Structure formats: structure tokens, C-alpha cells
């Protein structure tokens, strides 16, 4: 049967979109993912990882990427956990090759609940297997993780060419903190790439209010 994996990249940064990645393959060809070594991608330079990405795409029966913008994140009526689960559903419902078994990494949320959330949102019937650290346990989920990370890094590099060197985009990054402070000071607000709801951004805003 056809199986799918889903994972995301960019959950914690203040800069950039949240990327949902989906990978689809026939259970009979999982051997191929093991052979290319999808489980050891994080220990490779984005150079090798890009080559891994390219090999991945030719092997998978199908793959899908969904970019969730910072504006979408900031206007959410629920928590980030609920938001990631609904976007997992959006991407899964867009597949052209539907799977009967779906594996996902539940991250910090209870597995049974995260899985029920996705099963309830799916427009087609399938078994959803949610597990912590599924990205290390299941090849197809590791595959989805690579898709999401490579896609996200590509978008990041593209954004820096337009907005400049803003660091990693994470709140703890000194360069990121300075870039956001300088931007707000020069323009009086933030560009669309910033998640205004992130504490780091919100605080710079307040300080700007004469302080």
C-alpha cells in the first residue's frame, strides 16, 4: 500500500514561514529510503542534504510542500499546536496520491490526540500513526523532514537576499535581535517576514513606544 509521512520545519523562529513537508511512497520501497540514509540528514551539510533531497524526490511516489506565512501565524485563533495540526491536514488533503497509513511526529502534544485531530480533518479514510520522535523511527517521516528543512532553508536564503543578513531567524540569535531592532527603529514597524506575535518582536514594539 501507499504510506505517507508528515513533518514541519520552522516552528520556533521569529523570522520566516512554517514549512509543512509530506512524503509519499509504496511500503514495498521503504528499503530505498534506508539505502539513501534519510535518517542521517541532519548530520550533513546543506550541500550533501540538497543532493539527498534531489535523490529523495526521484524515489518518492509523491511529495508536497505547504508554506504557512508569518501573517497567518500571527492571526491564528488557536495555539501553535492546533495550527500545526490543521496545516498538517491541509497538506494531506492536497495529495494527488492518497495514502492509507500516515505517520507523523507529534512533537510536544499527546500522540492519541494529535492523531485524532488529523484523522478528523482528513477528507479521506486512513490510519494515522502519531508518535514522539517519529522522525527518527520512521524512514518516511525522516523523508518528510528533509523535504521541509531543505524547502525552508531555500526560502530563508531567498529572504536574506531581499532583506539582508538577519541571522538564523531565531530569537536567541544576537544578529536576529539586532536586525529586528534596527528595522523597527528605521521603519517604525516590521516587514511581512516577521511574526509580530513572537515575544521578541512584541517587546521591541513596546520599547519603541518611547522607551
Short note summarizing the structure:
The chain has helices spanning 30-36, 46-59, 70-74, 80-92, 111-121, 134-137, 139-163, 174-187, 199-208; strands spanning 2-9, 18-26, 62-68, 101-105, 127-131.
Characterization of this structure:
α5 links the parallel β4 (101-105) and β5. The protein has 211 residues and is of the alpha/beta class. It has a 5-stranded mixed β-sheet with strand order 3-2-1-4-5. 37% of the residues are buried. It is built from 9 helices and 5 strands. The protein is globular and about 60 Å long. The longest helix is centred in the C-terminal third of the chain and has 25 residues, at 139-163. The chain has one domain (1-211): Ribonuclease H-like superfamily/Ribonuclease H (Nucleotidyltransferase, domain 5). It is classed as hydrolase. The entry lists the keywords RNA*DNA hybrid ribonucleotidohydrolase, hydrolase. It forms a monomeric assembly. Crystal structure of the ribonuclease H2 from Pyrococcus horikoshii OT3. The protein: Ribonuclease HII.
How many angstroms separate the termini? 61 Å
CATH fold-level name: Nucleotidyltransferase, domain 5
Provide the CATH superfamily: Ribonuclease H-like superfamily/Ribonuclease H
Q: What's the domain count?
A: 1
Overall 3D form: globular
Kindly name the structural category.
alpha/beta
Q: Tell me the major beta sheet.
A: 5 strands, mixed
- The number of distinct helices, counting runs of at least 4 residues, comes to 9
CATH class division: Alpha Beta
Work out the helicity level: 40-55%
Which second-level CATH architecture applies?
A: 2-Layer Sandwich
Strand content: 15-25%
C-alpha Rg, in Å? 18 Å
**Secondary structure tally: strands:** 5
Q: Can you write the helix and strand succession as a string?
A: EEHHEHHEHEHHHH
Strand order of the largest sheet: 3-2-1-4-5
PDB class: hydrolase
Keywords: RNA*DNA hybrid ribonucleotidohydrolase, hydrolase
Assembly: monomeric
Entry title: Crystal structure of the ribonuclease H2 from Pyrococcus horikoshii OT3
Amino acid at each position: 500500500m501507499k504510506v505517507a509521512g508528515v513533518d514541519e520545519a520552522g516552528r520556533g523562529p521569529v523570522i520566516g514561514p512554517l514549512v509543512i513537508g509530506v512524503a509519499v511512497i509504496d511500503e514495498k520501497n521503504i528499503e530505498r529510503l534506508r539505502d539513501i540514509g534519510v535518517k542521517d540528514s541532519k548530520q550533513l551539510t546543506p550541500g550533501q542534504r540538497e543532493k539527498l533531497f534531489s535523490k529523495l524526490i526521484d524515489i518518492l511516489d509523491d511529495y508536497y510542500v505547504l508554506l504557512v506565512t508569518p501573517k497567518e501565524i500571527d492571526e491564528r485563533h488557536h495555539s501553535m499546536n492546533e495550527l500545526e495540526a490543521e496545516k498538517f491536514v491541509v497538506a494531506l488533503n492536497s495529495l494527488r496520491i492518497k495514502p492509507q497509513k500516515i505517520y507523523v511526529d507529534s512533537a510536544d502534544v499527546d500522540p492519541k490526540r494529535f492523531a485524532s485531530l488529523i484523522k478528523a480533518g482528513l477528507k479521506y479514510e486512513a490510519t494515522v500513526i502519531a508518535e514522539h520522535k517519529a522522525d527518527a523511527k520512521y524512514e518516511i517521516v525522516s523523508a518528510a523532514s528533509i523535504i521541509a528543512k531543505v524547502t525552508r532553508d531555500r526560502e530563508i536564503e531567498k529572504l536574506k537576499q531581499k532583506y539582508g543578513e538577519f541571522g538564523s531567524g531565531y530569537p536567541s540569535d544576537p544578529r536576529t535581535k539586532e536586525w529586528l531592532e534596527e528595522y523597527y527603529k528605521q521603519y517604525g514597524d516590521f516587514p511581512p517576514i516577521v511574526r509580530r506575535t513572537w515575544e521578541t518582536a512584541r517587546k521591541i514594539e513596546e520599547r519603541f513606544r518611547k522607551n
